[PDB]
Amino acid sequence: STLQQSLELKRKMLRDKQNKKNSGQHLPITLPLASQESAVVEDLLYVLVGVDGRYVSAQPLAGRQSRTFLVDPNLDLSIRELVHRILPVAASYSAVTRFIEEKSSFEYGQVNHALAAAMRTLVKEHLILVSQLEQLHRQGLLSLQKLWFYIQPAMRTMDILASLATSVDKGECLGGSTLSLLHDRSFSYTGDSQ
Amino acid sequence: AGRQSRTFLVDPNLDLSIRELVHRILPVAASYSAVTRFIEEKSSFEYGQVNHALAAAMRTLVKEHLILVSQLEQLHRQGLLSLQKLWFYIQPAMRTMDILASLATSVDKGECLGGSTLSLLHDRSFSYTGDSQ
Amino acid sequence: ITEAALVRDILYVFQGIDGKNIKMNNTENCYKVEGKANLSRSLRDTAVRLSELGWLHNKIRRYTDQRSLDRSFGLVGQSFCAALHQELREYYRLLSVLHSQLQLEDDQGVNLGLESSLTLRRLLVWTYDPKIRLKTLAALVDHCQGRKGGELASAVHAYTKTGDPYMRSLVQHILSLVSH
Amino acid sequence: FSFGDPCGDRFERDTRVSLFGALVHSRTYDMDVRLGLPPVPDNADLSGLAIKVPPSV
Secondary structure (H helix, E strand, O other): OHHHHHHHHHHHHHHHHHHHOOOOOOOOOOOOHHHHHHHHHHHHHHHOOOOOOOOEEEEOOOOOOOOEEEEOOOOOHHHHHHHHHHHHHHHHHHHHHHHHHHHOOHHHHHHHHHHHHHHHHHHHHHHHHHHHHHHHHHOOOOOHHHHHHHHHHHHHHHHHHHHHHHHHHHHOOOOHHHHHHHHHHHHHOOOOOO | OOOOOOOOOOOOOOOHHHHHHHHHHHHHHHHHHHHHHHHHHHOOHHHHHHHHHHHHHHHHHHHHHHHHHHHHHHHHHOOOOOHHHHHHHHHHHHHHHHHHHHHHHHHHHHOOOOHHHHHHHHHHHHHOOOOOO | OOHHHHHHHHHHHHOOOOOOOEEEEOOOOEEEEOOOOOOOHHHHHHHHHHHHHHHHHHHHHHHHHHHHOOHHHHHHHHHHHHHHHHHHHHHHHHHHHHHHHHHHHHHHOOOOOOOOOOOHHHHHHHOHHHHHHHHHHHHHHHHHOOOOHHHHHHHHHHHOOOOOHHHHHHHHHHHHHHHO | OOOOOOOOOHHHHHHHHOOOOOOOOOOOOOOOOOOOOOOOOOOHHHHOOOOOOOOOO
């Protein structure tokens, strides 16, 4: 999981930065359509928290990839395709949250820790949004088309975050290399104001 | 039984989590009862001016504890008191009362009197070097 | 299993008490949900998440009990134990506040599909940052395990460099208190 | 005998209003506050769900 890679990055950053940081501060140590929709809402609300649903279960993550899910084959093809389109957002969220929670450790240095902390804060805002959508579903205010529409921006944000995480992990960017990677990513998001 | 902390019998049919919370709180009440017994006994004129003054200060602190408890009782009567809020509010009070009771029990074991009592008080004040309150 | 019973069990686990349907699994050092079939796998994962907090609470309380009795910790050790107890008191205040909010949600009785309703997912979100704080404190305790006096002071100075700004501020305050 | 009011230290103050960091988007001095989350934006079904960026202030 992204958490294991981020923790390894933390240990590496701690050693390299300690050699770099002359400052003596040591790092801290058959279902009805409505019933199918309801079951899928429960599964998605679990997947957004990284929990397998009753009808939608997560597949094991192979490498630094987004989490894959197993969907019941008996779901509507249109529903199944919408689920597979939205599930990428929850997988990206889970990977970003794991990386954020691990690399926010002092061993990763203030730059990587702050980057992970910011990712965690944005994941928290996303989770707040998702909880409000879950409430709307409990209120009956969440439709499948409304769900798809609401997750589309969340899907794009999560996909951008997952692409950034995978780029940082492939480049093993740390410190000044991490700052260079951040600059390059900021140039890569020239078309995405958010 | 003897110079032991007061023990309580709780109805066995209480929730296990509730029973454990009750048993966690009951130590504060046992300390309070022991402290009150010590204060009331050593408050006799026979105990000398130093021990009498110590008992008077303990009585003042017991009065403050009773005031707090009465306000919490009012909140419960108001329906405003939850078990977790009570536990949180009493935790610092529980620690303070436990420290005071431990000091009282140490003084009682040492039978400290006068200058020996003052030395024991100084040593206890040093024992609270880590506890600013 | 009603959601309210799970809420009660999770609030007890935050206090280190086994719930009616969630009991401490000593093998996992976490509260385990009783094997009644009707628990959702998502609900099970949420219970595990809360039991991580209960495990941290129990670890902190074990440490506090182990060190409050050790006179040999010295004035610096006593100050460190006092700081740990103070942080535990703040944590217990937070847990009490969360319990009171859950009680307010229970008292209102309405499954209001409003964004403000206390859901198990909303509870998990609201405790995520507290969970991170508690995880940081437990890792610090583990790294500081067995250290006292100047070794504790050295560990505290090392702990001031935490990357989490909230953790960094907390560790700075703890360092200042232990250095006092 | 009380958990002292975190009026003094900014770190302590934030801990208290965040309940030791438990609160995410809210701060409170009131112990009897019913915890609510921000409502779902009306455009979420229209514009999707945006990641809320904390204000720079």
